[PDB]
Amino acid sequence: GKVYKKVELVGTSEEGLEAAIQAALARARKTLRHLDWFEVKEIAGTIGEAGVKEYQVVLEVGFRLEET
Amino acid sequence: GKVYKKVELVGTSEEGLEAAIQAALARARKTLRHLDWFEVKEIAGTIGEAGVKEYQVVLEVGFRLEET
Amino acid sequence: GKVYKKVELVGTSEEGLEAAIQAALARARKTLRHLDWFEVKEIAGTIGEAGVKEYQVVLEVGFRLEE
Amino acid sequence: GKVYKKVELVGTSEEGLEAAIQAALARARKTLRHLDWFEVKEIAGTIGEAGVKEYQVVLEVGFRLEET
Amino acid sequence: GKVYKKVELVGTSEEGLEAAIQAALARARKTLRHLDWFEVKEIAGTIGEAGVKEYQVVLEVGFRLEE
Amino acid sequence: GKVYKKVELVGTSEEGLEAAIQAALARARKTLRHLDWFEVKEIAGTIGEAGVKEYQVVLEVGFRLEE
Amino acid sequence: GKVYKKVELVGTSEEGLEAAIQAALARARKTLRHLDWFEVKEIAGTIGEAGVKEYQVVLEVGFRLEET
Amino acid sequence: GKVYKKVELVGTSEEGLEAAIQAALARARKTLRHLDWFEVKEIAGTIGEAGVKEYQVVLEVGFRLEE
Amino acid sequence: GKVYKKVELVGTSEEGLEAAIQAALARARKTLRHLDWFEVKEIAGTIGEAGVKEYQVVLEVGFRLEE
Amino acid sequence: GKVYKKVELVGTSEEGLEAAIQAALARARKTLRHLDWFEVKEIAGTIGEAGVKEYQVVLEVGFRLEET
Amino acid sequence: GKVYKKVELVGTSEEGLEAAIQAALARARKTLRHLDWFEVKEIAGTIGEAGVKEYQVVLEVGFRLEE
Amino acid sequence: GKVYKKVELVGTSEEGLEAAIQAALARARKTLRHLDWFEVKEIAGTIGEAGVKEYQVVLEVGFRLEET
Numbered sequence: 014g015k016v017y018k019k020v021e022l023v024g025t026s027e028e029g030l031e032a033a034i035q036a037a038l039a040r041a042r043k044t045l046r047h048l049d050w051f052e053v054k055e056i057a058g059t060i061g062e063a064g065v066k067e068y069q070v071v072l073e074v075g076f077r078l079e080e081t
Numbered sequence: 082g083k084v085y086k087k088v089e090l091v092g093t094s095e096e097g098l099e100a101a102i103q104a105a106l107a108r109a110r111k112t113l114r115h116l117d118w119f120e121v122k123e124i125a126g127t128i129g130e131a132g133v134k135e136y137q138v139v140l141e142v143g144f145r146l147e148e149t
Numbered sequence: 150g151k152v153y154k155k156v157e158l159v160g161t162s163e164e165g166l167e168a169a170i171q172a173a174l175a176r177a178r179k180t181l182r183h184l185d186w187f188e189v190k191e192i193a194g195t196i197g198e199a200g201v202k203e204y205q206v207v208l209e210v211g212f213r214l215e216e
Numbered sequence: 217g218k219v220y221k222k223v224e225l226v227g228t229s230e231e232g233l234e235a236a237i238q239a240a241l242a243r244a245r246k247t248l249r250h251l252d253w254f255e256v257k258e259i260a261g262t263i264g265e266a267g268v269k270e271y272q273v274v275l276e277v278g279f280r281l282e283e284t
Numbered sequence: 285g286k287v288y289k290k291v292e293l294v295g296t297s298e299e300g301l302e303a304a305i306q307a308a309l310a311r312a313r314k315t316l317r318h319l320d321w322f323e324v325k326e327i328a329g330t331i332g333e334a335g336v337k338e339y340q341v342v343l344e345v346g347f348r349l350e351e
Numbered sequence: 352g353k354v355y356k357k358v359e360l361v362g363t364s365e366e367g368l369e370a371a372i373q374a375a376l377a378r379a380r381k382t383l384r385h386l387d388w389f390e391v392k393e394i395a396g397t398i399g400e401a402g403v404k405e406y407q408v409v410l411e412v413g414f415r416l417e418e
Numbered sequence: 419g420k421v422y423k424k425v426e427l428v429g430t431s432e433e434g435l436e437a438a439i440q441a442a443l444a445r446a447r448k449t450l451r452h453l454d455w456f457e458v459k460e461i462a463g464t465i466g467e468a469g470v471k472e473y474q475v476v477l478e479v480g481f482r483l484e485e486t
Numbered sequence: 487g488k489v490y491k492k493v494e495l496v497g498t499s500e501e502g503l504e505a506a507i508q509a510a511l512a513r514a515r516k517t518l519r520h521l522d523w524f525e526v527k528e529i530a531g532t533i534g535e536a537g538v539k540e541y542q543v544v545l546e547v548g549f550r551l552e553e
Numbered sequence: 554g555k556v557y558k559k560v561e562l563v564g565t566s567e568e569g570l571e572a573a574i575q576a577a578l579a580r581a582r583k584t585l586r587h588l589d590w591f592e593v594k595e596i597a598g599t600i601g602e603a604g605v606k607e608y609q610v611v612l613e614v615g616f617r618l619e620e
Numbered sequence: 621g622k623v624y625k626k627v628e629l630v631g632t633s634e635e636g637l638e639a640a641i642q643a644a645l646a647r648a649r650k651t652l653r654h655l656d657w658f659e660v661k662e663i664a665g666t667i668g669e670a671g672v673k674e675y676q677v678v679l680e681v682g683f684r685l686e687e688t
Numbered sequence: 689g690k691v692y693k694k695v696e697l698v699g700t701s702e703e704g705l706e707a708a709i710q711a712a713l714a715r716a717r718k719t720l721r722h723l724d725w726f727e728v729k730e731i732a733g734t735i736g737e738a739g740v741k742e743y744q745v746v747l748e749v750g751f752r753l754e755e
Numbered sequence: 756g757k758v759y760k761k762v763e764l765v766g767t768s769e770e771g772l773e774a775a776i777q778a779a780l781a782r783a784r785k786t787l788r789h790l791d792w793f794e795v796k797e798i799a800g801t802i803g804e805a806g807v808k809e810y811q812v813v814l815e816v817g818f819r820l821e822e823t
């Protein structure tokens with residue numbers, strides 16, 4: 014009778030992969046409660062002159078639905 | 082003309098798989114209208130002393146979007 | 150040696166998953182011989198006012214071909 | 217960095233595949249802002265007396281999340 | 285209690301993707317009854333001098349089994 | 352810090368799917384400690400005169416490794 | 419224009435993989451006309467005292483449908 | 487003992503899917519010889535104010551290697 | 554009732570694919586009992602001056618767990 | 621016939637992804653010999669108040685079997 | 689440090705699977721240097737009156753890029 | 756419209772995952788123009804006495820084709 018929902022977010026960062034994920038979670042945190050877990054679905058990114066411009070990490074974020 | 086949306090839910094139950102799915106659908110039903118179909122994506126669970134503690138079924142629920 | 154064929158069937162039931170599979174196999178059994186094994190490919194279903202209306206299980210049924 | 221969300225929509229149309237996609241995006245457009253890209257996940261459809269009755273295209277639509 | 289079968293067909297057409305699907309369905313329609321839905325599994329094709337010679341769409345066609 | 356191992360087991364049962372999963376876990380539990388979670392990878396089975404003879408559920412069982 | 423059907427067969431042989439495929443095709447050609455191509459989907463087998471007992475190759479066989 | 491190569495190209499077009507595929511093949515055709523077949527791997531696109539801005543079709547193009 | 558385990562092995566051989574599989578099964582046979590079936594998951598290999606140096610077949614081997 | 625075995629491990633770490641992998645491999649190396657290569661299968665993690673609590677990386681580790 | 693490229697080839701042969709792979713590698717080795725490994729992605733073929741006419745093996749060939 | 760090509764590279768590095776990606780892009784950048792995006796397909800590596808010897812990241816690099 015616990016139900017969870019998963020939403021698909023993409024985090025981005027110039028710094029690295031961890032930072033990309035943290036960006037997604039940090040935005041999730043602002044409006045969604047009872048965030049429990051995340052799964053990484055894809056890693057992609059953009060390229061510029063210095064190599065990687067932006068890391069982009071597609072993740073599913075699971076959280077418990079409040080009842081009623 | 083019709084457009085549907087799919088949301089990803091995870092039902093849980095100590096009783097069985099069917100019970101887990103029904104849990105997800107019961108919760109969806111409280112706030113969503115025109116639920117039409119579901120697809121099971123993963124079946125997993127936690128383990129305790131008596132075996133399966135919790136069945137967890139990841140499912141996509143599809144429903145028809147109302148008009149604007 | 151022997152050759153098998155696999156057919157793709159979808160069983161449905163209001164009772165449960167097992168009942169869905171059994172319904173597919175009970176229909177296969179009516180016309181096909183030497184049914185050996187099955188594989189579940191998808192589980193889906195329809196929704197009504199009581200929750201699950203119909204469980205739908207898509208399976209591949211393997212059977213030995215007669216020469 | 218920026219964060220994006222992906223939602224899973226299913227467009228339908230009697231005309232063709234392109235019209236199915238457009239139907240989804242047209243409905244997205246009514247309530248969502250900063251729609252950026254889409255990915256097609258499945259193509260399916262229903263069958264009637266004249267062949268295809270309805271094309272159905274399951275797509276993920278990605279859009280930029282606004283701040284705060 | 286209803287059971288469906290799925291058959292795997294490949295439609296081809298020089299015109300386009302829709303026309304390839306319709307071709308598969310038209311041929312199905314000739315001999316099969318209670319065709320309900322289809323799923324597209326692959327899109328491929330052959331190449332000639334003017335580009336696409338033939339669109340080829342692999343689809344699964346599902347239909348209700350009589351009894 | 353903590354490291355887990357996953358092992359791939361196949362439970363079987365004539366009764367149903369739940370009973371199959373439990374059979375795997377029950378056998379795991381006899382020799383392995385700190386069983387935490389499982390994932391179902393495939394569902395298959397054998398066919399006899401009465402329909403399903405045996406349900407077979409392939410699962411991955413994860414458990415915490417001791418030091 | 420032309421429409422093909424794919425059927426899923428499993429060829430078996432104690433000799434090897436090629437022989438398993440050939441067994442499937444040989445049986446196909448006994449009742450099916452206009453066999454064009456095949457795809458290998460899985461390779462499996464049984465084990466005995468001398469190693470492999472039986473190679474089993476699951477293949478899709480494609481053939482051109484005739485007109486009524 | 488013929489050998490083929492596959493290259494992965496992405497065609498784009500504002501008009502439709504077919505047009506996107508044709509655009510990739512038209513470019514292929516300029517520099518590559520013995521183009522035989524293609525496979526569509528993904529369909530995606532960009533969104534603008536009028537809906538689809540750009541259809542993008544990722545496809546593998548196969549062609550026979552000369553000696 | 555019965556429970557099986559699957560272990561993931563990689564056979565190698567310079568001779569061919571069959572020989573690669575057999576090498577994995579011959580080694581399994583040394584220490585494991587009640588080997589029943591195998592599934593090939595990947596086929597890969599290394600390249601040398603004469604072409605294929607080593608065929609590598611990744612397979613899951615299934616066997617019945619004793620009481 | 622060299623023969624290799626693959627075992628499926630999950631590494632975890634609060635630091636990052638690299639640290640999670642290294643944890644799995646450090647534990648592997650304590651009891652297993654001739655560790656050759658690894659493949660990452662999934663990246664997931666748990667969420668806490670500061671974002672990522674735990675990175676979890678599922679990997680397959682391949683090693684050469686001795687002989688017996 | 690090192691960077692590799694993978695190209696996708698399709699070998700064909702009337703003889704067997706092994707000969708199909710060897711053909712792709714033999715052609716690779718004429719123009720490409722530092723060929724290291726290969727992965728088989730698909731196995732297919734064409735059918736004629738004696739059964740298999742042509743085995744076709746899709747493989748990725750990996751090789752180390754020079755300076 | 757425009758046409759892009761994707762090429763499949765494998766970047767390696769002893770330092771980490773990011774470094775591996777950057778190595779691939781740095782080598783692409785030497786000879787290819789209009790590099791736009793990348794997709795990570797696999798993460799693997801080799802194992803030595805100190806854990807990870809080499810991180811290996813298989814990625815697809817997309818770039819816009821010039822006009823001929």
Ligand SMILES: CC(C)(COP(=O)(O)OP(=O)(O)OC[C@H]1O[C@@H](n2cnc3c(N)ncnc32)[C@H](O)[C@@H]1OP(=O)(O)O)[C@@H](O)C(=O)NCCC(=O)NCCS
Pocket residue numbers: 018020022040041042044045078112113114115144145146147148221281
């Ligand atoms: C938070 C959440 C789980 C709560 O779900 P919930 O219990 O159903 O609450 P909701 O607000 O979604 O209620 C459903 C809404 O859709 C409407 N709705 C229900 N059926 C509908 C239908 N078929 N067609 C159109 N709208 C429908 C309901 O009327 C309700 O809207 P209302 O409040 O204006 O009346 C859900 O809204 C959610 O997951 N939001 C997205 C989270 C997210 O991704 N945020 C970004 C994080 S960075």
Ligand SMILES: CC(C)(COP(=O)(O)OP(=O)(O)OC[C@H]1O[C@@H](n2cnc3c(N)ncnc32)[C@H](O)[C@@H]1OP(=O)(O)O)[C@@H](O)C(=O)NCCC(=O)NCCS
Pocket residue numbers: 044045046047076077078079086146221223225243244245247248281
């Ligand atoms: C637009 C959107 C991105 C904004 O995300 P957001 O910043 O999280 O804003 P939301 O409206 O979803 O806010 C989260 C809501 O869920 C509630 N909520 C948060 N955690 C919850 C939980 N665990 N359980 C239940 N409810 C929860 C919040 O209270 C809030 O609802 P409230 O305003 O009634 O209090 C998001 O709402 C969304 O993606 N909507 C769906 C878009 C869509 O697919 N529309 C159809 C297009 S055709």
Ligand SMILES: CC(C)(COP(=O)(O)OP(=O)(O)OC[C@H]1O[C@@H](n2cnc3c(N)ncnc32)[C@H](O)[C@@H]1OP(=O)(O)O)[C@@H](O)C(=O)NCCC(=O)NCCS
Pocket residue numbers: 018078086088090108109110112113146247248249250279280281282
């Ligand atoms: C019901 C639903 C389909 C209706 O979709 P909708 O027509 O877009 O209605 P929404 O409420 O989602 O409208 C979009 C919202 O996102 C906001 N928004 C639009 N674009 C945005 C963007 N780029 N960034 C942030 N917010 C945005 C809109 O302002 C609007 O919120 P507002 O009313 O506060 O102004 C959708 O809200 C939904 O699927 N909800 C989740 C259902 C769910 O999972 N419930 C739990 C069931 S167990």
Ligand SMILES: CC(C)(COP(=O)(O)OP(=O)(O)OC[C@H]1O[C@@H](n2cnc3c(N)ncnc32)[C@H](O)[C@@H]1OP(=O)(O)O)[C@@H](O)C(=O)NCCC(=O)NCCS
Pocket residue numbers: 180181182183212213214215216289291293311312313315316349423483
């Ligand atoms: C129409 C259909 C669903 C009906 O299925 P059904 O009830 O089993 O009817 P079938 O004709 O297939 O009956 C089984 C046949 O196989 C035979 N058979 C049964 N087991 C067998 C075995 N193990 N080995 C060989 N033959 C066997 C039966 O004897 C029977 O043949 P018979 O009437 O000559 O005695 C099924 O025949 C079908 O899906 N056909 C293909 C449809 C298709 O794809 N057409 C092209 C559309 S474009």
Ligand SMILES: CC(C)(COP(=O)(O)OP(=O)(O)OC[C@H]1O[C@@H](n2cnc3c(N)ncnc32)[C@H](O)[C@@H]1OP(=O)(O)O)[C@@H](O)C(=O)NCCC(=O)NCCS
Pocket residue numbers: 154214315316317318347348349350351423425427445446449450483
């Ligand atoms: C050969 C084949 C392509 C021809 O297809 P076809 O043009 O549709 O011809 P069919 O004989 O299958 O005709 C369809 C049959 O199903 C029946 N049928 C149609 N719809 C049905 C439905 N909804 N429910 C039950 N039966 C149905 C038709 O009445 C017809 O049977 P009938 O002649 O007794 O009236 C197809 O039968 C086939 O692929 N057979 C299997 C080939 C195979 O795998 N053989 C083994 C090789 S090793």
Ligand SMILES: CC(C)(COP(=O)(O)OP(=O)(O)OC[C@H]1O[C@@H](n2cnc3c(N)ncnc32)[C@H](O)[C@@H]1OP(=O)(O)O)[C@@H](O)C(=O)NCCC(=O)NCCS
Pocket residue numbers: 382383384385414415416417418558560562580581584585618625685
């Ligand atoms: C043969 C096999 C199926 C028997 O499994 P089993 O019934 O659990 O018997 P095991 O010997 O593995 O017993 C479990 C061991 O793990 C230990 N163990 C249990 N839980 C543990 C934990 N969480 N952390 C660390 N160790 C644990 C037990 O103490 C026992 O070890 P011990 O005998 O040193 O005390 C199993 O050992 C196996 O599949 N082996 C690998 C086969 C293989 O791949 N060989 C190569 C073929 S080429």
Ligand SMILES: CC(C)(COP(=O)(O)OP(=O)(O)OC[C@H]1O[C@@H](n2cnc3c(N)ncnc32)[C@H](O)[C@@H]1OP(=O)(O)O)[C@@H](O)C(=O)NCCC(=O)NCCS
Pocket residue numbers: 154156158176177178180181214289349449450451452481482483484
């Ligand atoms: C039972 C079965 C394995 C027997 O296969 P088989 O040995 O090839 O025998 P078939 O009856 O299929 O013979 C092939 C038929 O297709 C026809 N056929 C062969 N090549 C054809 C072609 N290229 N185009 C159209 N028809 C063709 C043959 O003429 C023959 O039909 P006919 O007897 O009317 O002349 C096969 O028919 C089958 O799998 N049927 C479907 C089983 C099923 O799903 N039943 C439903 C279970 S609930």
Ligand SMILES: CC(C)(COP(=O)(O)OP(=O)(O)OC[C@H]1O[C@@H](n2cnc3c(N)ncnc32)[C@H](O)[C@@H]1OP(=O)(O)O)[C@@H](O)C(=O)NCCC(=O)NCCS
Pocket residue numbers: 491493495513514515517518551719720721722751752753754755760820
């Ligand atoms: C056409 C094609 C199949 C011919 O392949 P080929 O027979 O090997 O011919 P190539 O020109 O590629 O020869 C290999 C080149 O790589 C070089 N090379 C070989 N090994 C190398 C290595 N390990 N590291 C770096 N370069 C190497 C060779 O020196 C040669 O270059 P060079 O002529 O400057 O000395 C191949 O070049 C190709 O598929 N090109 C891309 C097609 C394409 O996608 N075009 C866009 C269509 S829209």
Ligand SMILES: CC(C)(COP(=O)(O)OP(=O)(O)OC[C@H]1O[C@@H](n2cnc3c(N)ncnc32)[C@H](O)[C@@H]1OP(=O)(O)O)[C@@H](O)C(=O)NCCC(=O)NCCS
Pocket residue numbers: 517518519520549550551552553693753760762764782783786787820
């Ligand atoms: C740069 C690139 C996009 C340009 O593609 P293009 O427009 O086709 O230009 P190409 O040089 O490849 O032209 C095709 C070549 O293949 C030859 N060719 C065409 N068809 C052929 C066939 N069927 N068999 C053998 N060769 C063929 C052409 O003759 C031409 O070679 P030539 O100039 O010696 O006459 C393409 O060459 C490419 O993607 N190269 C690889 C990029 C790469 O991965 N580099 C490493 C980065 S780390």
Ligand SMILES: CC(C)(COP(=O)(O)OP(=O)(O)OC[C@H]1O[C@@H](n2cnc3c(N)ncnc32)[C@H](O)[C@@H]1OP(=O)(O)O)[C@@H](O)C(=O)NCCC(=O)NCCS
Pocket residue numbers: 356416584585586587616617618619625627629647648651652685
């Ligand atoms: C190291 C390893 C490759 C050696 O495999 P091996 O050559 O088969 O050696 P094993 O010890 O496993 O021998 C097989 C065992 O299973 C038993 N056995 C064989 N068949 C069996 C069966 N069908 N049912 C139950 N037990 C069986 C054998 O009796 C033997 O145990 P015993 O020594 O008590 O008699 C293997 O044990 C292994 O991969 N271990 C796990 C490594 C691992 O993941 N460690 C954690 C790293 S972090």
Ligand SMILES: CC(C)(COP(=O)(O)OP(=O)(O)OC[C@H]1O[C@@H](n2cnc3c(N)ncnc32)[C@H](O)[C@@H]1OP(=O)(O)O)[C@@H](O)C(=O)NCCC(=O)NCCS
Pocket residue numbers: 356358360378379382383416558618651652653654683684685686687
């Ligand atoms: C329990 C377990 C996690 C403990 O792993 P561990 O810490 O590595 O302990 P192990 O017993 O496997 O130790 C590794 C063994 O492999 C041997 N070994 C190490 N590298 C080897 C190699 N490359 N080749 C052959 N043998 C090797 C070691 O010498 C040791 O055997 P030994 O005690 O006879 O000297 C592991 O053994 C396991 O997962 N067992 C299988 C559990 C299982 O599936 N049981 C059935 C449940 S129903």
Ligand SMILES: CC(C)(COP(=O)(O)OP(=O)(O)OC[C@H]1O[C@@H](n2cnc3c(N)ncnc32)[C@H](O)[C@@H]1OP(=O)(O)O)[C@@H](O)C(=O)NCCC(=O)NCCS
Pocket residue numbers: 491551693695697715716717719720753786787788789818819820821822
């Ligand atoms: C050998 C190889 C690795 C060397 O890669 P490289 O270091 O980039 O060398 P390239 O020839 O590809 O150099 C890039 C070329 O593309 C051109 N180019 C770069 N960006 C481009 C763009 N955006 N649009 C069009 N052309 C472009 C460059 O100008 C250069 O061509 P040029 O020498 O005529 O000026 C690469 O060419 C390759 O893998 N070739 C294919 C190998 C193959 O499959 N052969 C068949 C084996 S059976």
Ligand SMILES: Cc1cc2nc3c(=O)[nH]c(=O)nc-3n(C[C@H](O)[C@H](O)[C@H](O)COP(=O)(O)O)c2cc1C
Pocket residue numbers: 083085115117118119145193194195205226260272274
């Ligand atoms: C992409 C998609 C997938 C569907 N999958 C199923 C299915 O799994 N099983 C089923 O019975 N119906 C399925 N349907 C049909 C729907 O459940 C439903 O009957 C149909 O969309 C009509 O919806 P509406 O009456 O609300 O307009 C699917 C429909 C779509 C659009």
Ligand SMILES: Cc1cc2nc3c(=O)[nH]c(=O)nc-3n(C[C@H](O)[C@H](O)[C@H](O)COP(=O)(O)O)c2cc1C
Pocket residue numbers: 597598599609690692722724725726727750752765799811813
């Ligand atoms: C991503 C990738 C995948 C590889 N897969 C295999 C494998 O399938 N089997 C194998 O024996 N070697 C495999 N290798 C190892 C390489 O082929 C080779 O042994 C190693 O990269 C040394 O090459 P180098 O000397 O050119 O640097 C793989 C290497 C990489 C980079």
Ligand SMILES: [Cl-]
Pocket residue numbers: 020088223
């Ligand atoms: Cl959502």
Ligand SMILES: [Cl-]
Pocket residue numbers: 493695762
């Ligand atoms: Cl290339």
